[PDB]
Amino acid sequence: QKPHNPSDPLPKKYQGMRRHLQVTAPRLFDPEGHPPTHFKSAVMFSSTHPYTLNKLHKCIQSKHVLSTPVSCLPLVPGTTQQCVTYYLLSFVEDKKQAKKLKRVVLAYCEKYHSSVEGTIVKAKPYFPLPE
Amino acid sequence: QKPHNPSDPLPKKYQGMRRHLQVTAPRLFDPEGHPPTHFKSAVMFSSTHPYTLNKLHKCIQSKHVLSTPVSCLPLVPGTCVTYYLLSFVEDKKQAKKLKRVVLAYCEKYHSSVEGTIVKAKPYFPLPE
Prior knowledge:
Largest sheet of chain A: 5 strands, antiparallel
Domain Protein LANA1-like DNA-binding (chain B): 11-126
Number of helices of chain A: 3
Protein name (chain B): 73 protein
Number of domains of chain A: 1
Oligomer: homodimer
Shape of chain A: globular
Radius of gyration of chain A: 15 Å
Largest interface: A-B, 46 and 43 residues
Distance between the termini of chain A: 18 Å
CATH topology of chain A: Alpha-Beta Plaits
Order of helices and strands of chain A: HEHEEEHE
CATH superfamily of chain A: Epstein Barr virus nuclear antigen-1, DNA-binding domain
């Protein structure tokens, strides 16, 4: 896979969520300023739906929040009673931003993408994002 | 992006590292014992070399350690792709163990590979 290119315009379908995120969390989606020096935190967004996280991958992108493309979690051996769970990581500066991003994204998703779950994640000393 | 199949055999070229992991950290790579109830921790292994991570994706697999397939990290605005996988483990103790062991091997044979300790608050959304 290859990472998202910010310059690419959003499809119309995704514009609703993006606009909502810009209004609700304007500091995390402010097109101005410099990205944070370190991304010590992230929210893992997960869903059993294979395509719902595509929307999140495209919408949850700015200078202050960087999202991986959609991948999938590993299977728990050797259960057959399970399904594939898909996920992405939305990297942010600190836990404070992560809690905020989770809350805001889930609030939107609880109504329209209810299978989406969020998990606050933390790295030490921070995440190895290419510089 | 399809998850690792534990029922599938390992290609010969990966068997070496798997054997090394089995011998070095037997408690993480042994079929015996009880798998973790929660996976609270992970090691993210990252590298600009995707084929190397494909090796780690297949080799770093057991009932006690669960690695995602290889994906990639986003670019940091204001700039080559960096790839990653997550290896999920039980707690930070296992994560430190896994990181030291994998990086000891990679230090000589795959020097591009980096490891970062990752902690989920409160756990990773893996099934019970």
